[PDB]
Design a protein around this ligand. Structure first.
Ligand SMILES: *[C@H]1O[C@H](CO)[C@@H](O[C@@H]2O[C@H](CO)[C@@H](O[C@@H]3O[C@H](CO)[C@@H](O)[C@H](O[C@@H]4O[C@H](CO)[C@@H](O)[C@H](O)[C@@H]4O)[C@@H]3O)[C@H](O)[C@H]2NC(C)=O)[C@H](O)[C@H]1NC(C)=O
Lengths: 387, 145, 48
């Protein structure tokens, strides 16, 4: 049983693609074996993806695992609603309800909004780039009106890397305009550090300031450079390094030859890569549950050119979508379950604040129970009471 | 994509058409690659894309100054999903500059079954903050609705 | 010491350091140059 799958990896996602292979051998079987035809492409270019899709499609493919961008996502979701090809991605959740998509990434919109109510914030600023959709911004915008908050929403993405020294001082002249001491960082991990390094140098990281890192990869980036500053830094985790399942992974993964599996030698792993390694598991457990049900999926003939006019949807596509979406496996990203639209459901998200001795978990956000804390601390009001 | 390659294989010299917020990333990509020349009256691109002739003049600056004109400081901004969130993010970045208090509410996703109810649900919630200053920014059809 | 200072936040408006040598611009200064704090030193090689 030789199964052909198409791979869409952006330029230099080395840890993801490395984890992609260590999953191939982890979930390797003697029943069948996934034969991946991989395409290295610039994700941003819609033309590049389109021709790579047409390369994969005419070659005959059962499923595609890839990454998209806010520029490309409406090329992938448009060609996957037509040619019924299943798409697995660790990228941001789709803006709406697109079919034949398996978003390995849990919607973060739900967690962040329930976090702000915990700190009892009322006035803050929002920093974001559109790279992971304007969905998360319209979330804090809509919720702002309901219980009256005050949010300074600033687009941070469109700054070139030739003149950026005076676009950050200018930025934080508008953020002293209302004594802004509470800032949300909903950005790419790179833009997070570019912001932080700049914030370090204008010294807005002492006691009084409070940051929220709105991505599923908190301990992914650098945090030591804001470890002794004093300011409060909050973020989200999803790759629990205390869970024994990932702990075994961490034992092996941190000890691989670094030349073989690039940027994988650490005792830590990015959430995008920890989704890819969990994405392989779901694709494997789906193609076992297709032969277990004895249902056949073998492509009758070639698919032909993808621009086929009129286009023919090969029937077994709607079954592969079904099988994929009904899989329930346990991986790095905790629990993996989907619904009729590919959205991750019944998932754990960790809330992690920064402290002196390191990062620390005060609790978790549930998709059903909202923000629920963890009992491991002593009472703070518990001082010396005088008789 | 099909309609483009259809015209491209026909070897036309310049394409005239439209697009949506979703499709524009396809049009622009195939033009900056195949050197295809495109002309459109739909909303201006989100940057500097080559081989594109936007007949629609940049609307942003005109709107921004009109608020600056009327000496507003606290207004409501209903918005549609259509012509991008360009003329919204503009007034939401300038919010801090000239001291504004912007209430932005999405309206481009109302169902036509309860259209008359949701439109009366919004405004009877806008007498909460009693905001009597509203900018619309919509497809002319959604305006009269 | 400078590197250590930046990390702990003792280089904002409210602090003042005096670099006691003949080569102020000889070292690195850009890592606190925007910090708001005032830093003084001494130059012995006038580039002008
Ligand atoms: C939504 O997501 C929930 C969180 O992942 C998920 O939760 C769990 O439910 C399953 C089964 O109900 C739990 O699995 C078990 O753990 C117990 C205790 O360690 C084991 O004994 C058990 O072994 C079972 O043993 C049976 C013996 O006859 C055997 O027949 C069964 O097949 C099975 O092997 C399971 O290993 C899991 O731990 C739960 N997670 C939690 C809360 O920690 C929900 O299922 C999911 N909701 C739905 C309805 O989709």
């Amino acid at each position: 049983n030789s199964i052909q799958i198409g791979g869409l990896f952006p330029r230099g996602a080395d840890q993801e693609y490395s984890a992609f292979r260590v999953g191939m051998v982890q979930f390797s079987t003697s029943e069948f074996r996934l034969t991946p035809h991989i395409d290295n492409l610039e994700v941003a270019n819609s033309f590049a993806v389109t021709n790579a899709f047409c390369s994969q499609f005419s070659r005959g493919v059962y499923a595609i695992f890839g990454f998209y961008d806010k520029k490309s996502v409406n090329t992938i979701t448009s060609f996957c609603g037509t040619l019924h090809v299943s798409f697995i991605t660790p990228s941001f959740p789709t803006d709406g309800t697109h079919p034949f998509v398996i978003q390995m990434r849990p919607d973060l919109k739900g967690a962040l909004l329930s976090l702000i109510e915990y700190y009892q914030w009322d006035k803050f600023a929002y920093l974001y780039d559109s790279d992971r959709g304007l969905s998360t911004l319209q979330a804090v915008l809509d919720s702002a009106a309901e219980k009256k908050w005050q949010v300074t929403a600033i687009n941070v993405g469109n700054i070139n890397n030739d003149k950026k020294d005076e676009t950050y001082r200018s930025l934080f002249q508008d953020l002293e305009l209302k004594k802004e001491r509470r800032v949300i960082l909903d950005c790419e991990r790179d833009k997070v550090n570019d912001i932080v390094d700049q914030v370090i140098t204008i010294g807005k990281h002492v006691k009084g300031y409070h940051y929220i890192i709105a991505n599923l990869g908190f301990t992914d980036g650098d945090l030591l450079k804001i470890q002794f500053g004093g300011a409060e830094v909050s973020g989200f985790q999803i790759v629990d390094y205390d869970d024994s399942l990932v702990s075994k992974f961490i034992e092996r993964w941190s000890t691989l030859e670094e030349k073989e599996y690039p940027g994988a030698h650490t005792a830590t792993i990015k959430y995008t890569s920890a989704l890819t390694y969990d994405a392989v598991q779901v694709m494997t457990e789906a193609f076992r549950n297709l032969r277990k049900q004895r249902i056949e999926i073998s492509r009758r003939g070639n698919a032909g050119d993808c621009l086929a006019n009129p286009a023919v949807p090969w029937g077994q596509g709607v079954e592969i979508e079904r099988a994929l979406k009904q899989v329930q496996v346990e991986g790095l990203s905790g629990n993996i379950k989907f619904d009729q639209n590919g959205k991750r459901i019944n998932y754990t998200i960790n809330i992690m604040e920064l402290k002196t001795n390191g990062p620390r978990k005060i609790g978790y956000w549930s998709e059903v129970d909202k923000m629920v804390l963890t009992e491991d601390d002593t009472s703070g009001l518990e001082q010396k009471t005088v008789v």
